[PDB]
Symmetry: C2
Subunit: 304 residues, 2 copies
């Protein structure tokens, strides 16, 4: 019973967070095997961030200029490289706590847990979605850079996100663990705009199915709709177009509730055109889009 925005257990990732310090700048790094991953702008000052030539800045650095600290164990650096927007510091000590892990580049609309950190130490954990416009709505302060987002599948930690920048807009931008930014963003303090965000339609439908599973049915209607007629309504409300793949992905939920996807879409149509009329769905007065169909299945079936 009940439905909550739920993060993955963060233990496996806590054992991997280290404090990285080049010069005056200190941010978080991710220590896996004998390599430490961190934002490359750790080698920058606030003055350099206006327009840094990263190659020229890194060439002034040597292994001994990088101070990695895992709690109390000071790691020794024996190699350094720049992969895209991340630094790869080779160290002498392999992390004894290295989990089974993968690096993955998620797609917009997918979710992941963020372990927010400061000075290599964990502060908290929260779930978030990669927005269609490749931003995330997180909670990051100065020095939280290097905090990572991840999913856990049984035994394996799939790292998918590393935090780099807070935009003037207040939204957050970052890279995969290969250092390739999500979205058009760059790691410098220049004027950067995110672009039009849209609502993740497939996730809203998943969350409506979640609401039915938990007893909230007041939005279920007799009407139905066509995938092409719904998308005419969605586009009006800046909802991402619903594809047939999305419909197929909702199949498991449609079967568990005996509600056809297109019947659920018709209910959403009504909600978009007329609103909630003061009611709530799963304790929310807005349509929630940070739950994937898999997030709903996971939480509604007790995946371990």
């Amino acid at each position: 019973s009940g439905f909550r925005k739920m993060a993955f257990p963060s233990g496996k990732v806590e054992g991997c967070m280290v404090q990285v310090t080049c010069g005056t700048t200190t941010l978080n790094g991710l220590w896996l095997d004998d390599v430490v991953y961190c934002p490359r702008h750790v080698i920058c000052t606030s003055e350099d961030m206006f327009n840094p030539n990263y190659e020229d800045l890194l060439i002034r650095k040597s292994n001994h200029n990088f101070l990695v600290q895992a709690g109390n164990v000071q790691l020794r650096v024996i190699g350094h490289s720049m992969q895209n927007c991340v630094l790869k510091l080779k160290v002498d000590t392999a992390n004894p706590k290295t989990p089974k892990y993968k690096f993955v580049r998620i797609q917009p609309g997918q979710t992941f847990s963020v372990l927010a950190c400061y000075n290599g130490s964990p502060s908290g954990v929260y779930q978030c979605a990669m927005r269609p416009n490749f931003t995330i709505k997180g909670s990051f302060l100065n020095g939280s850079c290097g905090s990572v987002g991840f999913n856990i599948d049984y035994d394996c930690v799939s790292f998918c996100y590393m935090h780099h920048m807070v935009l003037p807009t207040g939204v957050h931008a970052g890279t995969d663990l290969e250092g390739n930014f999500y979205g058009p963003f760059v790691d410098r303090q220049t004027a950067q705009a995110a672009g039009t965000d849209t609502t993740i339609t497939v996730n809203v439908l998943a969350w409506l199915y979640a609401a039915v599973i938990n007893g909230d049915r007041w939005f279920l209607n007799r009407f139905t709709t066509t995938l092409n007629d719904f998308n005419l309504v969605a586009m009006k409300y800046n909802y991402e177009p619903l594809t047939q793949d999305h419909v197929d992905i909702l199949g498991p939920l449609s079967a568990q509730t005996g509600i056809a996807v297109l019947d659920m879409c018709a209910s959403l149509k009504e909600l978009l055109q007329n609103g909630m009329n003061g009611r709530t769905i799963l304790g929310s007065a807005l349509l929630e889009d940070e739950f994937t169909p898999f997030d709903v299945v996971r939480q509604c079936s007790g995946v371990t």
Copy 2:
């Protein structure tokens, strides 16, 4: 920047979750030092749960009837006792992962993180408040009993909650780690009602201060109010009365924003009487009350 409902890092608690199995029933237990804590109704069948005589049921059990499994390490039971509504199973192996920990009984309105589990394995983590009526709005399935709620202060895990029951109402009830229920609830499948819930007024004000810190100011007004006149409005809207202790607790936030508490209370008065008029505050269309003044300070200052 940004404000999220944030759970504590759950690593320290993951290392403590074990699978407890008496007879057919299996639920989660908490393994600290050489003792395992779990709901006493693990010794019950669904038939016994109607009206169990727990003393008589436990007296039919011996140490060898309790199957504790920590991942793959099967612990040997060498003692068993009933403290209030929890069982204390003495085992031969001390948990090598036992953190510095305390048991605490929280007060209504305080928050804590829940590590939801199934079969002794962690599923996810989420933050929640002890409602004024001593329920919690969580996410629990069959077998999630024994999942625990906790806070972390620097090095110490303060365990404050263990999940026992899902009420017919859909809300969740549980005990402290001494086995004393929060609220009037009992561990049997009888008719139980939670009683009138109210909104945690001090938390809403904290969250309004959070909104100011993050750029949302559209609700700040010129008016002020009296503590006694505000509570006349609060009582009408089933908001808990605001005491002077609450005002003092908000002092740190009032200082960081230059907004007097009673000026913030006047803004809330307006929000309660006129609503949000379609606007949002920190991405929510309802007034949020699961953030304590300390939760806001923690997340707005990057506590590690």
